[PDB]
């Protein structure tokens, strides 16, 4: 990922800058501060040791200015490694011309822990050369102070500061790459968002009209949000409809590759509704050879009448332009009717908005009475015509009707880093500190091993509940560790991270509480071992700032004021001075790390957010794509641009109800409610579908009242163990299912009775996708019309059957009785069969 | 009530006429306006099935007048569709409104008009 651990230090610029200048200002304010120390009070017999003060002073505010420059934008971790080189050189001469008998060890130990800060913290350079410079700097400042239990004890400081300052380097890298990572994820989730939406839109404007999806993507009904996861049907009046239907259809469908067909609809379907847009008029939906429109349906219009007779026209001029373009000689019969009619949306699977009316059937009747090429229309469409046009009465010879021609990173894993090394360095020191004594074996305060039994006991009860937290170990039980875990929130944080900051300082003052005036060495290494403590107490991030900044002050210096009286003053002096220091670099470190830490929270809060926003989105469009199209056709779209299939045998049924004609009482405003118990008894039987034995059965769409499936065609795999045929028989008992539901809801119903006209047949028939920036899913072939005509042909309650289905079925199991005899057109004369038996009482 | 077999078997009990099952349901504590999925009522199934018996023994059970299913008929209205005079004198004697009308917004007099009971028509005509 070299890119990417690029563009990582590409973003991270101003605040490694701010940290640069911070550095700077500080080293020279301390180094300002001891020019002043050697200067007016002691230290009066040389000029030595100001004029290498000054020259640090000219240097730091060079850097300061030169850091604004062009050749530092990749060049400035080599300035900071220049800038720390004169540090060490200026840190070991000050260090060199000692041990007369002339500065004590306490300055030196000071300036050591500043020097190895600024390096560790701020610098921003690689690890190895950082830990290698230290341990050399650490190795001569011991070395050249010699010009051994204390010099070993100096070492072991050495020790436990490396392990501080390499713990919070680790700790600031982790931050630092974390939160980055996580704003890149938190950027590239909204345009994948924004891309679902528009996906999203687009598909609810294909499968419904555009004045609804407009009033509801406000949700305006929430029921309909929910239900897209409910909505209104209306009524209206003086709308115009028009059907027009493909003359010859079986002709052109003979023998071809089943391919081109779906192109040619494509195009000419195009065309079609290209000029309906462009001719204000709104499509309603297709059935395979017949093509149909309305016009103000969503909103009326009062030349409706015009658009609908002008599209009449548009496509008997289209027709003719394509047969003159490809020489295919076909015609296509016009009907158009003017009414009242009902529209809405019925059922929650495959829905689509569609209108109801007497006047649709009498539409689509007087369209099968007309002649092709001409448009057949009404008196209804004559009340106002204007008869601006040729007024020709064209009349079946075999109602006042005409004819018109045209015209990491986890929070409690950090826990467990920094508990371990408050333990590991705290034993450390107390280990020096009893590793003091040289001549006497044992101390003769025994408040020494108290403390440091209860410091042990303390920290190994702390690390065991932070182990047993992380690893999830629950050796024992886990509800135990369940009310042993719950009680730490704002507050036990708070205290048992004061105890646990606190109390290195307490452990130093365990040998203090003995005499130390006496000799001098004692004093000069309390000092030492207790800035050594103090300097500790920044690890623990988890916790706030202030309080463990004056936690650390309070309980590491003020005790020294208290020691003070205790009376070597000039020492003191010098102590607190290294002191101040100490604390002013404590202040501003921890307060850097804490506002990162902030930050990296403010971050991933929002990084899950919008990953947890994406995701219903995603599911919301995916259930929308498989509301209209089968996951196949699917799948294969997604590297294609159409779809277009055969299949040489596949069962289908066709369903109607049939006393459903004198259930329009028409009393009630709007008569919805009939309309409205379809709905449930539709829904119902949707949900019929929900079974997982059902994956064979491909319900095609709703036809105004009726209801069309197939079978046989989804299971594209074939075993040598299956009986490839067994789809035709489960569409049977499905049919079967179908007659228990109504009949069962007739039961439930209040007095009134419904029948069905039910027909099943099998063929080859094809199958295709039409709509582009549009979606609709259709089947054609030659046994589809015949099973409806076979199926219009029907009795009520009787599931009529195709002879050929007959054949095939008769040694299934089932058995039929013989009905009559029906000529059909397109094939001819053909016998039909009903399944139901003894049903009447003679 | 919770798992409430109690309300689908004294509706079924109630269209049934089965007498014997509807007072052990009682002394059951069976839910006296207990209603099917759809709204219906055992005083409406009554009337369906006719047996006026049921609809005293309802009525002294503790039941409503303004009965509604999804079609919010009142069971006046279902009577008058029925063509029972009986069972809409029992019930229009509990103070059934005449001036009100279901979702379908007919009053109950359309109700018996396009029924073609007149007594009904005459029974709710010389109501206030």
């Known amino acids: 990922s070299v890119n990417l651990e690029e563009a990582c230090m590409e973003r991270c610029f101003p605040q490694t800058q701010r940290r640069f200048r911070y550095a700077l200002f500080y080293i020279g304010f301390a180094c300002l501060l001891w020019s002043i120390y050697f200067g007016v009070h002691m230290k009066s017999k040389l000029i030595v040791m100001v004029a290498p003060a000054l020259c640090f002073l000219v240097v730091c505010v060079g850097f300061f200015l030169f850091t604004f420059t062009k050749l530092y934008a990749r060049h400035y971790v080599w300035t900071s490694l220049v800038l720390t080189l004169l540090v060490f050189a200026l840190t070991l001469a000050a260090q060199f011309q000692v041990l007369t008998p002339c500065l004590s060890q306490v300055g030196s130990f000071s300036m050591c822990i500043e020097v190895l800060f600024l390096l560790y913290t701020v610098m921003h350079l690689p690890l190895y050369l950082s830990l290698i410079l230290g341990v050399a700097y650490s190795v001569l400042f011991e070395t050249f102070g010699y010009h051994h239990w204390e010099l070993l004890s100096r070492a072991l400081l050495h020790l436990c500061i490396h392990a501080i300052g390499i713990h919070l380097f680790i700790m600031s890298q982790v931050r630092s790459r974390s939160t980055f990572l996580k704003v890149g994820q938190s950027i590239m989730h909204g345009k994948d968002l924004e891309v679902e939406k528009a996906l999203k839109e687009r598909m609810i404007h294909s499968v419904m009209p555009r004045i609804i999806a407009d009033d509801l993507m406000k949700q305006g009904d929430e029921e309909s949000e929910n239900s897209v996861k409910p909505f209104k049907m209306q009524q209206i009046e003086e709308v115009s409809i028009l059907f027009a239907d493909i003359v010859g259809f079986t002709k052109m469908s003979a023998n071809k590759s089943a391919h081109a067909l779906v192109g040619l609809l494509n195009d000419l379907f195009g065309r079609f509704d290209r000029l309906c847009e462009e001719t204000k008029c709104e499509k309603i939906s297709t059935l395979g050879d017949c093509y149909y429109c309305v016009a103000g349906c969503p909103e009326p219009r009062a030349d409706h009448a ?149 410091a042990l006991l303390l920290e190994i009860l702390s690390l065991v509940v932070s182990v047993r937290m992380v690893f999830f170990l629950e050796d024992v039980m886990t509800c135990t560790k369940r009310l042993l875990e719950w009680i730490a929130g704002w507050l036990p944080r708070h205290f048992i991270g004061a105890i646990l900051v606190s109390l290195p300082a307490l452990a130093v003052y365990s040998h203090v509480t003995s005499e130390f005036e006496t000799n001098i060495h004692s004093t000069m290494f309390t000092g030492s071992a207790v800035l050594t403590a103090v300097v500790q107490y920044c690890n623990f991030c988890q916790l706030s700032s202030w309080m463990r900044s004056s936690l650390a002050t309070v309980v590491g210096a003020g005790p020294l004021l208290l020691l003070l009286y205790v009376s070597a003053s000039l020492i003191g002096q010098e102590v607190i001075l290294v002191f101040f220091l100490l604390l002013l670099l404590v202040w501003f470190l921890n307060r850097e790390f804490e506002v990162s830490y902030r930050l990296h929270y403010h971050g991933d809060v929002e990084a899950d957010l919008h990953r947890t926003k994406i995701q219903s989105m995603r599911d919301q469009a995916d259930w929308l794509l498989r509301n209209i199209i089968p996951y196949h056709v699917a799948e294969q779209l997604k590297v294609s641009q159409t779809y277009s299939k055969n299949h040489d045998s596949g069962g289908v049924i066709f369903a109607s109800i049939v006393n459903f004609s004198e259930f329009y009482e028409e009393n009630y405003e709007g008569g919805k409610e009939c309309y409205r118990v379809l709905n449930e008894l539709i829904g119902d039987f949707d949900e019929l579908l929900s079974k997982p034995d059902y994956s064979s059965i491909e319900k095609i769409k709703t036809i105004g009242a009726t209801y069309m499936a197939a079978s046989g065609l989804n299971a594209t795999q074939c075993r040598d163990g299956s009986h490839p045929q067994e789809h035709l028989q489960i569409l049977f008992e499905f049919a079967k299912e179908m007659m228990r539901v109504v009949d069962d809801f007739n039961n439930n119903m209040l007095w009134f009775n419904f029948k069905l006209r039910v027909g099943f047949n099998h063929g080859p028939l094809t199958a295709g996708v039409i709509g582009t920036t549009k979606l609709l899913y259709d089947i054609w072939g030659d046994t589809v019309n015949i099973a409806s005509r076979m199926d219009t042909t029907g009795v009520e309650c009787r599931i009529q059957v195709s002879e050929e289905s007959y054949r095939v079925l008769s040694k299934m199991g089932y058995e039929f009785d013989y009905r009559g005899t029906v000529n059909v057109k397109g094939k001819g004369q053909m016998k039909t069969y009903l399944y139901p038996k003894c049903t009447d009482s003679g | 009530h919770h798992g409430s077999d109690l309300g689908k078997k004294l509706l079924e009990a109630a269209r049934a006429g089965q007498d014997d099952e509807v007072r052990i349901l009682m002394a059951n504590g069976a839910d006296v306006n207990a209603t099917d999925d759809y709204g219906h009522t055992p005083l409406h199934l009554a009337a369906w099935f006719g047996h006026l018996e049921i609809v005293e023994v309802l009525l002294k059970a503790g039941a409503d007048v303004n009965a509604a299913d999804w079609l919010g008929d009142t069971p006046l209205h279902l009577a008058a569709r029925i063509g029972h005079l009986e069972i809409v004198e029992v019930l229009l004697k509990h103070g059934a409104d005449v001036n009100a009308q279901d979702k379908f917004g007919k009053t109950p007099f359309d109700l018996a008009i396009d029924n073609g009971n007149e007594d009904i028509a005459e029974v709710l005509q010389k109501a206030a």
């Open chain 1, 306 to 454: 015009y658009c609908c007779i002008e599209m009449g026209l548009g496509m008997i001029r289209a027709i003719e332009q394509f047969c003159q373009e490809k020489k295919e000689m076909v015609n296509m019969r016009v009907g158009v009717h003017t009414g009242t009619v009902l529209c809405g949306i019925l059922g929650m699977r495959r829905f689509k908005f569609d209108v109801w009316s007497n006047d649709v059937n009498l539409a689509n009747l007087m369209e099968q009475l007309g002649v092709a090429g001409k448009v057949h229309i009404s008196e209804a469409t004559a009340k106002y015509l204007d008869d601006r046009y040729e007024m020709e009465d064209g009349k079946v010879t075999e109602l006042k009707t005409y004819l018109i021609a045209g015209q990491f990173a986890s929070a409690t894993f950090s826990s467990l880093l920094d508990v371990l090394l408050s333990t590991t360095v705290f034993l450390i020191l107390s280990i020096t500190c009893f590793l003091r004594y040289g001549a006497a074996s044992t101390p003769p305060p025994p408040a020494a091993l108290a403390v440091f039994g209860a």
